[PDB]
Design a protein around this ligand. Sequence first.
Ligand code: CLA
Ligand code: CLA
Ligand code: CLA
Ligand code: BCR
Ligand code: PQN
Ligand code: SF4
Lengths: 87, 81, 160, 80, 742, 146, 88
Amino acid sequence: YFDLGEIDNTTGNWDLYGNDDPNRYNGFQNKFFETFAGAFTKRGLLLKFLVLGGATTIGYLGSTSSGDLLAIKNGPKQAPIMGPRGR
Amino acid sequence: YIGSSTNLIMVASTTLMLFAGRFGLAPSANRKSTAGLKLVDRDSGLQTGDPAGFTATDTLACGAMGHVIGVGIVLGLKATA
Amino acid sequence: QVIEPLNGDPFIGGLETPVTSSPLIAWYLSNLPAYRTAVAPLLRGVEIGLAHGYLLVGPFVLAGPLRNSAVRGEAGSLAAAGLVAILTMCLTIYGIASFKEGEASKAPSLTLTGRQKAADKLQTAEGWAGFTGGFFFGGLSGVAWAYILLYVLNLPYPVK
Amino acid sequence: AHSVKIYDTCIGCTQCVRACPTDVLEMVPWDGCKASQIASAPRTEDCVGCKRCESACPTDFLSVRVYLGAETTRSMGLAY
Amino acid sequence: EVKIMVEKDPVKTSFEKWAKPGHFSRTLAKGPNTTTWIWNLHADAHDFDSHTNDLEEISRKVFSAHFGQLAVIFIWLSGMYFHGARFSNYEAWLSDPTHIKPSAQVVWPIVGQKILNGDVGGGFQGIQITSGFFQLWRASGITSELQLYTTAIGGLIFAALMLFAGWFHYHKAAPKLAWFQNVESMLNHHLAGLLGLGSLAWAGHQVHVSLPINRLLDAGVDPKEIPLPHEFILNRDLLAQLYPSFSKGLTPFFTLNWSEYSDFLTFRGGLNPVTGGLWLTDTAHHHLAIAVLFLVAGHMYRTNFGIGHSMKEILEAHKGPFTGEGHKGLYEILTTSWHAQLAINLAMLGSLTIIVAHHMYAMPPYPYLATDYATQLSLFTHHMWIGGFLVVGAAAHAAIFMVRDYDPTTQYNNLLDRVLRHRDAIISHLNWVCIFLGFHSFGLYIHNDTMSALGRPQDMFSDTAIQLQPVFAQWIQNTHALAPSLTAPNATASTSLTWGGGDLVAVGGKVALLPIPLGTADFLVHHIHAFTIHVTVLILLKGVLFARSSRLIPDKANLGFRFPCDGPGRGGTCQVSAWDHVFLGLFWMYNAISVVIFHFSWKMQSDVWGSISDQGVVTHITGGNFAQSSITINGWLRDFLWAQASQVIQSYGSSLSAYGLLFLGAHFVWAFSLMFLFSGRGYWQELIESIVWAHNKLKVAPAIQPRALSIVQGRAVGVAHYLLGGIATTWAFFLARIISVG
Amino acid sequence: WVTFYWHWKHITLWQGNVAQFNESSTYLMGWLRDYLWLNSSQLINGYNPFGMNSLSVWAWMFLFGHLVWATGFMFLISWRGYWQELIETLAWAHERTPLANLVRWKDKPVALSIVQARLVGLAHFSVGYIFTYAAFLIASTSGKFG
Amino acid sequence: NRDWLRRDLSVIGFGLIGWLAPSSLPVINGNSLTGLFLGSIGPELAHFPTGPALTSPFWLWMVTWHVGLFIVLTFGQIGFKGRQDGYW
Ligand code: CLA
Ligand code: CLA
Ligand code: CLA
Ligand SMILES: CC1=C(/C=C/C(C)=C/C=C/C(C)=C/C=C/C=C(C)/C=C/C=C(C)/C=C/C2=C(C)CCCC2(C)C)C(C)(C)CCC1
Ligand SMILES: CC1=C(C/C=C(\C)CCC[C@H](C)CCC[C@H](C)CCCC(C)C)C(=O)c2ccccc2C1=O
Ligand code: SF4
């Protein structure tokens, strides 16, 4: 099955599950998402505030956590276990 | 024992299956059932005195299906009635 | 009689099985937000984000480490929103690596039949850019709405 | 990609070409053997590097020799 | 058309072909030139397809090889009955088996090994056997060692008969190819003549010999005063005093009054409380039923009498819209290829041996089988290893059928052609379910190890933590316990005691069986088992499917079966062969079967095997630690591999010290395997070149050139030592631990 | 072998009974039982179903070594072309799966090359070997001081 | 394409009466009241509002009644298309 007039159809370049419908939403739903997700578009810009915002948000709740929230900030609550040879 | 229900079933299970194998109602050596359960004639090579094609294999085969079916009817009716 | 080759071609590595080209399956897969080739890729990326955002609150509130406290709504939703923010950066660095700014689309233009269609804009440097922001806003809203419907309104369910 | 080199110890037995699965080797005329032919590798960019030619070479030591160098999609043997 | 085709004197019985070693192969008939000739001499010794292209002589070779195998097995059975007759305490064990261990091997007092002749009981010294022959002879009704000696010399007579038949069917009257291609007659005479009449004859033995002798053995009668087996046949009043249904004398059989045979043909179920083994009225009804059912199934196919089935007509009518021309040519596959039939027969025999292992711990068929824990562990472990080896060999000969007997012209658009046409889908979806099973079982184990290490026992997968109860197994076990009341009426008890019907059977103060619990630990280890079986299927099925060709090597069928590689090209084509997939599936069989027998040993040492004291209290060997420690790898290393190995390492200076020696030597053979597996041929070849130089210096060079082992041979030697060393390690640890605590 | 000899010659010196080494080091069952099994008593009991001790990180690092070392066997026994055909099937599966075919690779997925396979198995073997012994050696002397 | 399994909406009807006409007859074997209203007693008894059946007699009948439905109502799928196609 080789054609020499359509090179994509004879090699497997098929949109197997694609659709050519232009739109199925309405204008009210579409204008809401592009307004809110307009500052999240650029890859270089989005990678900057996700690293800087992600480093702050793990250091905040890592430090403001309580004893019941995380056991490493609870500390010891009993007498320490003495090892052998008096150590 | 002759008039008992074991004897009357086992006679009639053997007789009707030999009747079916002789009068062309059951599969036999000289006639084959296909996937459509249709009786088509074949030459098995076995020669007896029957003009229909009943041979010594079928009287052992239909006697066995007279007995395999006939044992199950007798003990099926023994546990039920 | 039931199995065909892929678009009649036996030498492409696939088959037209009932799990691939059913009347029901090929209707389904053609309406899923990833295979809309003419919708703008920020809008269909919000639906890919709302979905995955919602579903991920479930295994993080019912199985996580803080599942036996009263903070199980707050701990698991921020854990579900944390996987959104990581996968947004995984979506960010994928579009930086795969697609270059100013290039064409690495997408099959031809459909199942011989009709010529427009190129899919998702496999571009700007199409995956708006797709990444669609997953970030949709994912953070999909987590927050599943947190609202579970631990703010507290709707009755057998397991919550 | 891979560099296949033919040396002057070759007897023109042709079995390096017959063992080649990617059509690298061919027999060119030569004046240094009884068979009056030596192998050569013009399509050495198509060489996978399998060294089937070195397994089929009866000359001690080998006349065909494959050196595994820079590997591309020809010499990796991929279909994807 | 089915009739006897043989021909007379194909090859003359001569020793001139014994003197030439490599006579079967054209390459080895020239004599040796390197030391690899010796290894290809043994590698191609049994490979009859590589010798000749004629399937008739191949089939004659296989038939006489079957007879030689039967001779070897009859010599082995002769030895095991002679060891019961002369070197055992079988009469002493048969007097009372709850205190005397089964022993049938006496060693010679030569080098300090006479300590291995331990105190097994009954005034006897010897190696305590774990093969189960004593319980088998008790179930056979064997009372004296004269019967064991008679069975040994009868087996020697049959071994001479198999040797004579192997000589006869290769040198005097050997069959032709169409005799072996009568597969309908062979199935008719294997189903009816072999498995039907064999079950009928053993049913007759278990009516006349096993049943009254084993009934007298339940009554506490001494075996020296029990009447001999022919006295029940002769004096039928002696047989009638134990079963009154024998007083009628074969008239209820032909008058269909089979319920009057309800005294000795029962559907009881469960175990004998006297012995702990299945009832022989049930085992005799079982054999009579599978005989009246295998003899029925042996009258199915068409030989030459008109009635029957041509199985080509069965296959060629089985075709579907998802396949098209399926099942066609598979008769030509299975009558012109020995390897395809060998693949199917090996898969059924290995899976069947696994069925045997499960249906013997769970429904112990022999008296005092269950309470002798050494026999139960060794029989399950042995049959699991044999079954795993035979299913790996099934995939092996499947792959040999692909590389040497698969004709693509006769197989177009059938099942096999389409399975080859989508083998990427099969291997990729198998790969996905293997990775999914690997995470969702072993990563669950890693999660339990991590939260048990991090001091979070509530964050685990325990019976007290997040539960993963096997609700399907826990329902099928209740369905099999609550069966006799409604779905299987005519049963006195239930099929097995491990279902949940109570009946705490105590034989000799030791637990035969009880209800087996299934919890989170059993769920985790069964998902380990499913994962390991699936991965073994993945390597083995990948070797079967990619035996012909691949995306990597499209001419792999021309390279053969036992080829190492194509070379360092295409990135490296190491272990592309189907043989190498059998080689890796041998390791995955080690992993699968070893975790199976480890789960077995820990599960029944923790939840089944133990002792019963007064007032119905059951103390197991490792009490209740399977539900809490077998969910972590540290418990498996600690409460199984360390706590239960506290009898294989301090067995020194005792009768079980040979298990310590073979435990350590099995570690040696395993670490010796890692020399062959991790290394390669060219290093050893140049080291041998240095050694050959040292031999040339002192004029002790052999003319047979010293060579390193081949890459296929180096992998074969490595996997042989890996399986031998690891299996012998588990054998030594098992047979020291469960003998010591049993 | 060197550090087995060091740790067992010293682990019997430090608690006094040098006769245990003087009677048991001459045969390998003494090495297996009185050194590898006896000193590992409080190693693998670092965490239990009942609870966890201070050696628990050394009990995990011991098991961790038995993972990585054995994982090296996967690279040292199984060799390349099995995994290359496996990754070929995986590449087909990714290239034909709906919703996942959209994601591409720029690097073509191949198996680990032969030198790389020997190096990865060797490094796994070494990491498992140094972590199994670092754990056992720092848990069978620091939990039973002497 | 798009006809991997044709509907032919009588096999769903003949398979419906293929597991009500030969499946709702009372039998003397096991003293069953009916073959399928004891199998339909699961909705009659084990039906609970969000508190479902656990360790129950429902799971068996259902696992037979559906297995009989997936061996008879699919047997007409072979049976009707075997008449339509050249199969026997
Ligand atoms: C003593 C009688 C006798 C003699 C002289 C011959 C003569 C011949 N035989 Mg043999 N044959 C005989 C008995 C005899 N056979 C029997 C008893 C069998 C049944 C097994 C056969 C079946 C048979 C086959 C199927 C084949 C022959 C063929 C051969 C030829 C040489 C093969 C060879 O090297 O043999 C020497 C072989 C051996 C010494 C191996 C014997 C192995 C025995 C069975 C024991 C194996 C198990 C044993 C316990 C070892 C286990 C391992 C151990 C470490 C514990 C030669 C014409 C071959 C032929 O003509 O083809 C070219 C051929 O393929 N024979
Ligand atoms: C009713 C007759 C009958 C019976 C009983 C068997 C029985 C057997 N066949 Mg056979 N066979 C027969 C007819 C029969 N065959 C027919 C008609 C064909 C031709 C189409 C074949 C062709 C065939 C081949 C090619 C092979 C067998 C093999 C086998 C053996 C199975 C392997 C095994 O370990 O089993 C358990 C083994 C035993 C229980 C040993 C029993 C041995 C005694 C002496 C009986 C065998 C002799 C004879 C077949 C029946 C005589 C009955 C006698 C007791 C009165 C077994 C001996 C295989 C084998 O091992 O080859 C040797 C093999 O692959 N058969
Ligand atoms: C019903 C059983 C059965 C059948 C008929 C065969 C038949 C065959 N196998 Mg095998 N196979 C099976 C099951 C079986 N196998 C199982 C169990 C496995 C898994 C291990 C395989 C895996 C398989 C592969 C991987 C291949 C075959 C091949 C062979 C062929 C010839 C091998 C040869 O010459 O022997 C050679 C015999 C030896 C080298 C003897 C060594 C025995 C083992 C490996 C080591 C010793 C084990 C022993 C118990 C330990 C004792 C130690 C002590 C001495 C110190 C032949 C067709 C080969 C072939 O080319 O097929 C065409 C081959 O490539 N087999
Ligand atoms: C000549 C003649 C005649 C006659 C005929 C007849 C009458 C016949 C008969 C025949 C018969 C009448 C036959 C029969 C047969 C039988 C058989 C063949 C059987 C078999 C059996 C078996 C198979 C087995 C059994 C069993 C069972 C089933 C179950 C279980 C038990 C037992 C095992 C026992 C007439 C008059 C017509 C006319 C003139 C001529
Ligand atoms: C050690 C080793 C060798 C060398 C193995 C050899 C040479 C086998 C040695 C067999 C014996 C020991 C020599 C032959 C013995 C003779 C029968 C002479 C008898 C002398 C005494 C044994 C009595 C390989 O060839 C090899 C190949 C591929 C991967 C790994 C390896 C590998 O590890
Ligand atoms: S195989 Fe070797 S000797 Fe023969 S032609 Fe090729 S290079 Fe020359």
